[PDB]
Scaffold this active site. Structure first.
Site, PDB file in Angstrom:
ATOM      1  CD  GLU A   1      -8.218   4.145   3.818  1.00 37.33           C
ATOM      2  OE1 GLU A   1      -8.636   3.715   2.720  1.00 37.33           O
ATOM      3  OE2 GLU A   1      -8.274   3.474   4.868  1.00 37.33           O
TER       4      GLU A   1
ATOM      5  CG  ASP B   1      -2.121   0.931   1.039  1.00 35.47           C
ATOM      6  OD1 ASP B   1      -1.902   2.138   0.806  1.00 35.47           O
ATOM      7  OD2 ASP B   1      -3.273   0.458   1.131  1.00 35.47           O
TER       8      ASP B   1
ATOM      9  CB  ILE C   1      -3.518  -2.489  -2.654  1.00 37.48           C
ATOM     10  CG1 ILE C   1      -3.001  -1.896  -1.347  1.00 37.48           C
ATOM     11  CG2 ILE C   1      -2.367  -2.979  -3.528  1.00 37.48           C
ATOM     12  CD1 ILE C   1      -2.191  -2.886  -0.551  1.00 37.48           C
TER      13      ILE C   1
ATOM     14  CG  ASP D   1     -13.279   1.992  -1.818  1.00 39.79           C
ATOM     15  OD1 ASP D   1     -12.187   1.441  -2.076  1.00 39.79           O
ATOM     16  OD2 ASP D   1     -13.712   2.117  -0.653  1.00 39.79           O
TER      17      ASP D   1
HETATM   18 MG   LIG Z   1     -10.122   0.455  -0.480  1.00 42.79          MG
END
Ligand SMILES: [Mg+2]
Length: 352
Positions: free
Chosen positions: A71, A46, A136, A288
């Site tokens: 994020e 990530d 990811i 997402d």
């Molecule tokens: Mg996600």
């Protein structure tokens, strides 16, 4: 294509992130035990994916200030003697960012690596231009060798104008059509990309093969429509998806993908319908869905919420939407919309 310069930078960045992730997944001991280590592979993949994406886009698009909506930050790579993870990512990023011919004699340090992650701290919004990255998607699939994807989108004044999906394990042929039952095919690893008004294309990952334009399913009857489901996800408000499919009378077997690569598969025409309904209290994040949304849209698909409203990416990191997300083609969406809101008004509101 629209945003051609941005599209080239994004395809280069996403592809390189896939190499870094594949280098970790193939190095998972090749045994089911994986040295019994912690989530170290998931975290270094990530952080490493986010790093190479940020470092490529910043170098390729030197004409504008870099703004990335992601994020995670670098707060974890500082507490504790985490250099075991920090330096292993730095070695992992430099090794991947060595077949670049643009960094060359660079060899970024540990401090340069965490600066690349902290330089992508945007909050989206309706103004400006922001990249949106999921380093990811499908962390569980990445571990079990299943389907995972790197999702990279671009917002322009709060509107999605570019999506790129890198699915290193997704085969080039229809995964839904298990009727093929062909050999190993050996053609595995797709790259989906689209920009506004320009169409959706699919290309072999890390291959100078020509891209091909892709379109959604031309399914006319809801009986032969196919639904996308989760490889492990059991509940997730299935009662809605069930009763919706029941009113539709769907009899085709479902397609089971466990990452954002669901969008890429639907945009090429493997399945016909995708329905996501988040649990109570969970707010859906923009990374997402932003890249997969335009990939489906530019291939003829309809991506709305429960009320038929288009998805709005200008409100920040979260996506306020009616119930969930509804994806289908032009012909199935009208009936699908009626089947949803009825099932919403029925079994759901019948609780009262
Ligand atoms: Mg996600």
């Amino acid at each position: 294509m629209a945003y051609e310069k941005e599209l080239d930078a994004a395809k280069k960045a996403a592809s390189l992130a896939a190499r870094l992730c594949q280098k970790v997944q193939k190095a998972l001991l090749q045994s089911d035990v994986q040295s019994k280590s912690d989530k170290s592979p998931v975290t270094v993949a990530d952080y490493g994916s986010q790093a190479v994406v940020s470092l490529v886009l910043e170098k390729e698009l030197s004409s504008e200030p870099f703004s990335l909506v992601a994020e995670e930050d670098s707060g974890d790579l500082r507490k504790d003697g985490s250099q075991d993870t920090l330096e292993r990512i730095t070695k992992l990023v430099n090794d991947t960012l060595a077949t670049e011919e643009s960094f060359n004699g660079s060899t970024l340090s540990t401090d340069d690596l965490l600066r690349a992650i902290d330089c992508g701290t945007s909050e989206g919004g309706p103004n400006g231009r922001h990249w949106v990255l999921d380093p990811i998607d499908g962390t569980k699939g990445f571990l079990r060798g299943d389907q995972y994807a790197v999702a990279l989108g671009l917002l322009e004044e709060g509107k999605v104008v570019l999506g790129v999906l890198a699915c290193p394990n997704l085969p080039l042929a229809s995964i839904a059509g298990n009727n093929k039952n062909k050999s190993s095919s050996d053609e595995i690893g797709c790259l989906f990309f689209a920009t506004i008004g320009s169409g959706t294309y699919m290309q072999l990952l890390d291959s100078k093969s020509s891209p091909v334009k892709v379109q959604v399913s031309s399914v006319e009857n809801p009986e032969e429509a196919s639904f996308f489901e989760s490889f492990e996800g059991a509940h997730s408000l299935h009662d809605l998806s069930s009763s919706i499919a029941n009113k539709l009378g769907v009899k085709a077997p479902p397609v089971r993908i466990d990452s954002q690569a669901k969008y890429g598969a639907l945009s090429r025409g493997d399945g016909a319908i995708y329905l996501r309904f988040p649990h109570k209290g969970y707010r859906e994040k923009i990374w997402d869905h932003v890249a997969g949304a335009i990939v489906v849209t530019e291939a003829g698909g309809i991506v709305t919420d429960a009320a038929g409203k288009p998805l709005d990416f200008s409100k920040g990191k979260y996506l306020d939407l009616d119930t969930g997300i509804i994806v289908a083609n032009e012909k199935l969406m009208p009936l699908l919309l009626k089947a949803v809101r009825d099932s919403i008004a029925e079994q759901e509101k019948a609780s009262a």
